[PDB]
């Protein structure tokens, strides 16, 4: 199906405790494949999926140079932004950056993105036309003008439509055995009394890749949000994901409830009922 | 000044993209690559000149100011006034120097034409 | 757009100063002057590429977007990833990559020396 490659950057100032923290991670789909942590020993881009370890020393030298250029400009950014908002030196602030590309089932470019946050909220973002900027406020507007002067949007479009898609494809081939696999969910169901006259049905889905999944409860063939508790999808730690959905049912009416599981690893969606 | 330094850094990479974006990498593009290596050298050299003139001056550098004065002056005379520049050649290189100065003056006139045509077509 | 043209004009003359200000004119600098004539061609060609890419109602021109995509992609491989794309060409490429690495170190040394307050 469709694929994406995404890089996530976090930059935290630590006033009175030294250098700002810098962390970079890269993903293909829901699989991390690289990391950089300014606090680690290596001071290098590091592998986090086994199909990237094959890349030679030149590649790793190259990604380390580029991430270091990211780290150092983000450090300047923290001061610049402090000045834009007239903030004291004593407070810690956070800069976040996310960029990457999507490709369709035919591996062709679909969309690219580049987003920049300050203190947890949108600062400036590249629009889907890969030409213009969304500037959240008057500080972002100053950044927008500098970024227009320097043709930042054109650099990003050139990367997003070329390098980003070229190297996404390459990772998808080299990591074909895992990245292009689908692990269907292993499903089951639990039951507990929750009151005098009520019980909880919990519909489980374990060991699934990719992470995208739909779990819905139906009572008599109609979907309900009521009593429906859906936990956020969580990582198992081994490359797969977990999720559950719970519904509170009047004790004695369990057989009126069905859980529906939709996942791309499923030939057809599943129907589970308490037995 | 941190701001001046930041602006010089920023200008450096602004120009790097203008070099990179039109740098086709072919065989028989080896001369374009050699030209762009020299352009990157000029970008770096001019950044250094800016650091020396502005930013306190970090003392241990030759202030470009007097060179800016003489070079502006010789250029106004080569391109516009046609007043003679003295001691710029001998008999063995008089002709090469006169030829390239003429080529140069034509290029500067063409540059003005090119730029002001842009303002005529879209700026007014 | 009026403002786009004005910015492109302004960038042309801003760069012309940077070319003019360091060029000593005499017979010892004939090769410097010839290089600078090419740089002046380059400034003019790039201004034309900006007009083609950024201006709404413009005449027929070759849109540079696809060469920008391809050139970006090739340079990332030449300088950083080393993914493969005679002996003379591979030698300028090696010199080019060394120059780009030196460029980075030159720029971030300026930030290190004067742009940080800590």
């Amino acid at each position: 199906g469709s694929h994406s490659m995404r890089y996530f950057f976090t930059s935290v100032s630590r006033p009175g405790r030294g250098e700002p923290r810098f962390i970079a991670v890269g993903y293909v789909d829901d699989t991390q494949f690289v990391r950089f942590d300014s606090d680690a020993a290596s001071q290098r881009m590091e592998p986090r999926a086994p199909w990237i370890e094959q890349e030679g020393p030149e590649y790793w030298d190259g990604e380390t140079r580029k991430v270091k250029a990211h780290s150092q400009t983000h450090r300047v950014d923290l001061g610049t932004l402090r000045g834009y908002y007239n903030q004291s030196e004593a407070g810690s602030h956070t800069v976040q950056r996310m960029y990457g590309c999507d490709v369709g089932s035919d591996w062709r470019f679909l969309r690219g993105y580049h987003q920049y946050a300050y203190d947890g909220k949108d600062y400036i973002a590249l629009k889907e036309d890969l030409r213009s900027w969304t500037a959240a406020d008057m500080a972002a507007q100053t950044t927008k003008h500098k970024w227009e002067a320097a043709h930042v949007a054109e650099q990003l479009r050139a990367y997003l439509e070329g390098t980003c898609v070229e190297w996404l494809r390459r990772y998808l081939e080299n990591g074909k055995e895992t990245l292009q696999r689908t692990d269907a969910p292993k499903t089951h169901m639990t039951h507990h009394a929750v009151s005098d006259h009520e019980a909880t049905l919990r519909c489980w889905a374990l060991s699934f890749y990719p992470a995208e999944i739909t779990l819905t409860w139906q009572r008599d063939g109609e979907d309900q949000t009521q009593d429906t508790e859906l936990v956020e999808t969580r990582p198992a730690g081994d490359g797969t994901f977990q999720k559950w959905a719970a519904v509170v049912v009047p004790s004695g009416q369990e057989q009126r409830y069905t859980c529906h599981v939709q996942h791309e690893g499923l030939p057809k969606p599943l129907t589970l009922r308490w037995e | 000044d941190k701001e001046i330094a930041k602006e010089i850094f920023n200008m450096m990479f602004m120009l790097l993209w203008r070099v990179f974006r039109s740098q086709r990498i072919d065989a028989n593009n080896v001369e374009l690559i050699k030209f762009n290596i020299r352009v990157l050298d000029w970008i770096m050299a001019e950044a250094d000149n800016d650091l020396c003139y502005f930013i306190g001056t970090h003392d241990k550098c030759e202030n470009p100011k007097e060179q800016w004065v003489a070079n502006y002056q010789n250029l106004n005379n080569v391109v516009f006034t046609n007043k003679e520049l003295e001691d710029i050649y001998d008999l063995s290189n008089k002709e090469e120097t006169k030829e390239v100065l003429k080529k140069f003056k034509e290029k500067v006139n063409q540059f003005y034409r090119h730029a002001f045509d842009i303002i005529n077509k879209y700026g007014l | 757009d009026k403002e786009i043209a004005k910015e492109i004009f302004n960038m042309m003359f801003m760069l012309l100063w940077r070319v003019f200000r360091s060029q000593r004119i005499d017979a010892n600098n004939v090769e410097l002057i010839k290089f600078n004539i090419r740089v002046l061609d380059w400034i003019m060609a790039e201004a034309d590429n900006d007009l083609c890419y950024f201006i709404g109602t413009h005449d027929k021109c070759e849109n540079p977007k696809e060469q920008w995509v391809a050139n970006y992609q090739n340079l990332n491989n030449v300088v950083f990833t080393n993914k493969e794309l005679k002996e003379e060409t591979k030698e300028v490429l090696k010199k080019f990559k060394e120059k780009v690495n030196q460029f980075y170190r030159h720029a971030f040394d300026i930030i290190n020396k004067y742009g940080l307050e800590h």
């Binding site: 990211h70 950014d77 320097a150 | - | -």
Partner: peptide
Amino acid sequence: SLLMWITQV
């Protein structure tokens, strides 16, 4: 593969 460089805000 990372972007080759980023620009100051």
